[PDB]
Amino acid sequence: AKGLRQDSNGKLRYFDLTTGIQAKGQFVTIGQETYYFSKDHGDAQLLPMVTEGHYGTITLKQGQDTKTAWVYRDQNNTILKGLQNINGTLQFFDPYTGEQLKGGVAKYDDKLFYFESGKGNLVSTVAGDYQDGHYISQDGQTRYADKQNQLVKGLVTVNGALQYFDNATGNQIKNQQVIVDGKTYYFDDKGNGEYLFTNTLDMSTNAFSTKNVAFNHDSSSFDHTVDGFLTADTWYRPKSILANGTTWRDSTDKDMRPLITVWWPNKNVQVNYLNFMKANGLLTTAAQYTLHSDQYDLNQAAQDVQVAIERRIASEHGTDWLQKLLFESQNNNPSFVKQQFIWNKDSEYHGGGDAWFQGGYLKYGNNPLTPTTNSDYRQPGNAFDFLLANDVDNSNPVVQAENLNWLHYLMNFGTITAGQDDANFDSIRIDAVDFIHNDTIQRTYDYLRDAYQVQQSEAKANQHISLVEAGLDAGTSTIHNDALIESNLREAATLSLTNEPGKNKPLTNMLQDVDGGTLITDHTQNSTENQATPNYSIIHAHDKGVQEKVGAAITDATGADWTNFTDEQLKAGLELFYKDQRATNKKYNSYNIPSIYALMLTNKDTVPRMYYGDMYQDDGQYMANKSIYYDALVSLMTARKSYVSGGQTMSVDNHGLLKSVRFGKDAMTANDLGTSATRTEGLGVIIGNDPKLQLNDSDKVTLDMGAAHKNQKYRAVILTTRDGLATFNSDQAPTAWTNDQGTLTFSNQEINGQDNTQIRGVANPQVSGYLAVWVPVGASDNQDARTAATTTENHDGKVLHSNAALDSNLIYEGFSNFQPKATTHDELTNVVIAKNADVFNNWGITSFEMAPQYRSSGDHTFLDSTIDNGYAFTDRYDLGFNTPTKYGTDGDLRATIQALHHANMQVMADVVDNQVYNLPGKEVVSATRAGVYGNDDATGFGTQLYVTNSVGGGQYQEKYAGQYLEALKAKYPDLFEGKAYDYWYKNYANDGSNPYYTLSHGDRESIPADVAIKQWSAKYMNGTNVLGNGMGYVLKDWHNGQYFKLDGDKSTLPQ
Ligand SMILES: [Ca+2]
């Protein structure tokens, strides 16, 4: 007795065709209908299918809260209750409320069944259902005891959640896949369950399936196969073909058929493959195929699909139609492959607190089957690891030799490409310094010590001033002060200034420059030098406090998310953006920008960097549209070049107004007389964040300008007015005197009837509080307040020091993310810069930080590759050859670089060692889900072999990569040897107190010269962003987890 038949007595039962077992207490799908058979003696029960039905939501308050419940309801508003059969799946609804049950259990024929978290289809029999009982901890394990003191074993629901416990011991399984009655479930690090896919039974190779076996294990018989692994998109060559669904004939070498028509990874896929064919008229049948259908029926069904297929192949004398059917998209829907859970992003489990960008990451690992993509290293060696794209493994010796080789290329770009020596870069900027290994950072600085001797003297250090994207947390950097780091000014400004009226904290935070507890510099009484940490102050940058905020206007009146959009949508955004920026009340923009630039450009012990986007607007081309802040900013820069020097003394009086002041070259405190040049130097700033401020007639605000400035005339540089700020670049401006002491006394009245000299609250586009800058009258036409860096020898092993000489420098971040693409050669950014070389030198810019000049991948994966700023690149050696980059060609870059050298500036090469975008070539590697911190994530993806987009490069990487290494090892052999070093390490205190730094120790290995990364591959990467291929993309026998591989002694699936 096997199949559906009725016995001697009344009614009908069911028997497994395969085994012979009677179905009782189970679900089976026999031909058309789906049934349930009873616990009693298996007498059956019909579950009619529901075609046509609304599917919606209602409100129900049971007792506590009004919940909004989901319901099915048929066409006719009758809300369907109890167990129902819907599209050949079984979902369950509460018969009282009508609510859909998904991720839970239900009593049905004194038997508890479970429904998946997702769609809420019936997948398996659950063992026990517990609200009574409690947890226990025994032997360092976790377990669960019933109400009656005894243990629970196996798969049960504990307090509404699904969980599982070892059948022998009762140990709760955690962070592991496990099979229960052929169903694979995943249980998280906490222990809570989730269904994945029902596994097939896998039966004996019969008459028919004999001839669908693979012709041989050679490579020729298979295709679409990365590194010898079978993917879902693999076509194979059978031993024989069923010509026209009739004549079995030996297969020829030109014959191929798709693996997914004969083999499947789980029963889910197989059931969906059949019902898919039913839809597209390759299997005309009144039969219905569910997760409860007999394997025999499903496999027989799979053979009838081939019969019908082979007809259509015979007809069309080819198989391009099928390729199109299974693998390409149909009727604006995902393809058949992608529809499947095991072959899409849904089984990758994207997102999570730790997954900052592109929905998380995939940390590569090692595996016997994949000896090409295996790596001994892949250690992060820094606070963070993964950020974007394909994270490059910088712990690797060959990658460290390649990072030097690229450095040397950039540092000698002119000399290499065009034989032009004045066309080279001088300084660098390490992009994402906390995201790359310290070894290559250490080794990077060593190159700059070896090639330019920056440690020797501050004259040589200052000519090649480099900097990073980090605070004190970049330990390798701060240890010997090899580069500048970002001050806390930006943050400090963000609380006490950049917010709207009423949401601004007091300006006492701006007195000191502290990076979470540790002090960077204290402006209160800054009289000494060579003390503070070499740093750079900013308020905006290409990415910091802009992309966030610009995006804001883009999405409103446009809706496109900030990572991908059309040029039109961008242009429409920026319109509203700049249209808000010029207003008094600013939704998307920041307040008091000039006041903030005033601080940056007057504060001691910092090298401020100007942001292009604050002076010019991106609605127009490069240096095309001036911003509202332009005049204000140009004046302050001009003030700095001529006046700002000497010591600093900043305070906040009782009225709430910052009073920064500088005393001039030589003079370090308010009592110091100083040299004759001091008299016409040093300015005084007054700032305020109360636009509703109104001092009364008795109130007096003062600026003690110092003992050098007794009885001297002082003229305004910047003055707050009703409409904005009255700028002044010359002694032609309102003036005011100091008393016998040396003190500019102001008040709510005008100074000698000079309008706009009085102190008061004001609300206007360029300032929401008060801003006034004052310098001494009688400056020379060619005065300079800047101190020239000594050729003086340094023995203390520091590179950069904070002194007059360094504070004389002024960096310029000369690009934006949201520039439009030029329409002509003249409108391109690197030509414009070359034209306007003197315009920067006049403002007193010393360092000019260009945009990474690398060809963008233009894959619209992330913002950086949407708007093509140059951080998103494949060939990192291509700086605009042949076809231009956003900024220019390689000819235009060399023209720019020389234009800056001729205008006495240094040029910064922005170095991105972290990641690389869009590498077309494919490889198989073991990947596991991870977060920025290079940490394993507890996901149902687990650890799988994944086809990653890791092989690639470009024409110019082939050419240049690795080539200058043997050169370099000759000249500077110390770069290539091993080396011990020290670096700081930020510790976060658990008790909610301030962090603290501790000296850590490091040892970089030696590196090779001979080995060259001509192109990238898996083995030189730490990992890759989630690609969305799927958990089961590299195919494997999910019963036992054996991967398929093509060797002489292959592990073939068609078997
Ligand atoms: Ca990294």
Short mmCIF file of C-alpha atoms and ligand atoms in Angstrom, two decimals, residues 384-386 391-392 394 435-437 914 1022, ligand 1:
data_model
loop_
_atom_site.label_atom_id
_atom_site.label_comp_id
_atom_site.label_asym_id
_atom_site.label_seq_id
_atom_site.Cartn_x
_atom_site.Cartn_y
_atom_site.Cartn_z
CA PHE A 384 37.82 50.14 12.63
CA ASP A 385 38.18 47.88 9.58
CA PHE A 386 35.32 47.94 6.95
CA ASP A 391 38.23 46.76 1.97
CA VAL A 392 41.90 46.38 1.13
CA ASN A 394 46.85 46.66 4.49
CA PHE A 435 40.03 52.20 9.09
CA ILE A 436 43.47 50.94 7.97
CA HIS A 437 46.32 49.01 9.67
CA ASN A 914 41.25 51.71 2.51
CA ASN A 1022 39.90 41.98 3.99
CA CA B 1 40.70 48.29 6.37
#
